[PDB]
Design a binder for this molecule. Structure first.
Ligand SMILES: CCCCCCCCCCCCCCCC(=O)OC[C@H](COP(=O)(O)O)OC(=O)CCCCCCCCCCCCC
Ligand SMILES: CCCCCCCCCCCCCCCC(=O)OC[C@H](COP(=O)(O)O)OC(=O)CCCCCCCCCCCCC
Ligand SMILES: Oc1cccc(O)c1O
Ligand SMILES: Oc1cccc(O)c1O
Ligand SMILES: [Fe+3]
Lengths: 256, 256
């Protein structure tokens, strides 16, 4: 017996019973709830459904804002052991002719005092423009595509190269899409994002997400996960007729 | 409804977010809840789980208080198409030497006024002395045993014969069970009960349960299903091994 759970569960039972009474939750209503949950099981979407609606809140109690980088959710599609990119310019493993424009990501990783953190590993992950993540779609191999680890050079600079990401929409036919589009008459679009996770000994882990300026769904996140201080300016440099989206974010890790 | 599901969701959401924020629910925590909700769904347990925690309250929303036979929960163990029983004695289909105490039930099915209701049809099921329901158990056939339909006489009266039910315990090593035993530090034991569903045209269908005096889990039912007015007083009588437990109860339903 955990007393954390005896205390949380019992309050939580007493709340939901009251919700039921306040809102006259009927039996067929009930049977539909029960039934919808079941089908969230079957599509394997519990982690999407919950993160969709609640990661944002658990992430607000979990970390604080100040003079460093802000956390943001991790969502459902992170995968461990993604591969070290070393290279002439390091480039997310990706497909022959992987759809989209070329994107150069530059930046640095440092502590709340300015010092650069040579001992860090940035994991990145993002979804094809087709709108799937590797390891989690039947439209993509269980391989590491668009996922990789980067390491600050000894002066703290980071830079990698990938496609530039575009607005993702949660499968409109899954339980989560269906609630979102139909039952809620809304939408299931997220704005484009690069997911980052940075770790370093001596520092507190960072899980966050970089967004893009003027993004269609900037204010519309069907996951409600956006924070302005993370909406990024894009710049457009040509080299041999070839249009790099340039982006640049400077990470601060907190100590301990 | 597009509009009903909206009012509730958005209210359910807010509630749930406030829970998370108030108790500062951590990320490991959140992920533990995520897994438990997965587990429950990979066992076949939403119906048992949800029924155990809230069907009582869902049921209170849908009947009233008052004179109407005092409702109870269907459980997750109903089964359509139990056989009409006639035989003069009128017993529930059971195996030879079907274990345990033989039991006799008397009573009636009247309306608000007290006028016998003839179109009533009444189903009764329960579980073995060993604690199994027909059809949901490898240790019994997928065939009607201790499940049946009985029709009232012209004057009110009703009789069916079975064996006496005894306390049932919810699987000790599945998620519900674990929650009830390992994380909550309690038990998964429901009090001896006999299920009932009564029906008539021009009347609001009825569902409920009868428990017995001295039943240990009366006052700590795991699914909080027990209403004092549905505890049956037991009259121990011995027609010399076998030994009859005789009970009686007076059903009433509401009109239209
Ligand atoms: C619409 C009806 C609601 C359906 C939602 C059901 C959610 C119920 C989840 C209850 C979780 C019980 C899991 C037991 C925790 C566990 O596995 O122990 C592991 C860990 C060591 O023990 C822990 O420290 C984890 C603490 C768990 C605290 C959460 C208790 C659940 C309270 C409801 C929160 C949901 C919002
Ligand atoms: C840690 C948190 C645990 C969270 C547990 C999950 C709770 C269930 C998630 C809510 C699912 C409900 C989705 C709506 C069902 C639906 O899509 O079909 C709508 C149906 C068809 O109309 P056309 O119309 C309905 O009646 C659905 C109304 C139900 C609205 C759900 C409100 C959530 C409150 C449930 C908790 C209380 C039990
Ligand atoms: O990073 C994400 C978080 C939540 C839902 C998603 O579809 C996603 O890509
Ligand atoms: C309900 C819930 C769990 C077990 C039962 O027997 C029942 O009638
Ligand atoms: Fe994402």
């Amino acid at each position: 017996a955990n007393t954390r759970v005896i205390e949380l569960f019992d309050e939580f039972t007493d709340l939901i019973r009251d919700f039921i009474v306040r809102h006259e939750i009927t039996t067929p209503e009930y049977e539909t709830i029960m039934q919808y949950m079941i089908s969230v099981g079957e599509a394997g979407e519990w982690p999407l459904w919950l993160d969709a609606f609640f990661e944002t809140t658990v992430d607000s109690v979990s970390y604080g804002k100040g003079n460093w980088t802000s956390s943001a959710i991790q969502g459902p599609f992170f995968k461990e052991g993604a591969p070290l990119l070393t290279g002439k310019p390091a480039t997310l493993p990706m497909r022959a002719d992987e759809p989209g424009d070329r994107m150069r990501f530059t930046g640095s990783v440092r502590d709340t005092s300015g010092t650069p953190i040579t001992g860090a590993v940035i994991d990145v992950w993002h979804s094809t423009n087709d709108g799937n993540y590797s390891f989690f779609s039947p439209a993509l191999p269980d391989q590491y595509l668009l996922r990789g680890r980067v390491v600050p050079a000894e002066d703290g600079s980071i830079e990698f190269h990938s496609i530039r990401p575009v607005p993702y929409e949660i499968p409109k036919a899954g339980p989560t899409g269906q609630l979102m589009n139909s039952y809620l008459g809304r939408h299931s679009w997220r704005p484009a994002h690069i997911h980052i996770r940075i770790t370093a000994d001596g520092y507190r882990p960072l899980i966050t997400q970089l967004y893009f300026e003027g993004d269609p769904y900037l204010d519309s996140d069907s996951c409600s996960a956006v924070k302005s201080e993370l909406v990024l300016p894009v710049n457009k440099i040509d080299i041999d007729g070839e249009t790099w989206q340039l982006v640049d974010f400077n990470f601060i890790l907190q100590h301990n």
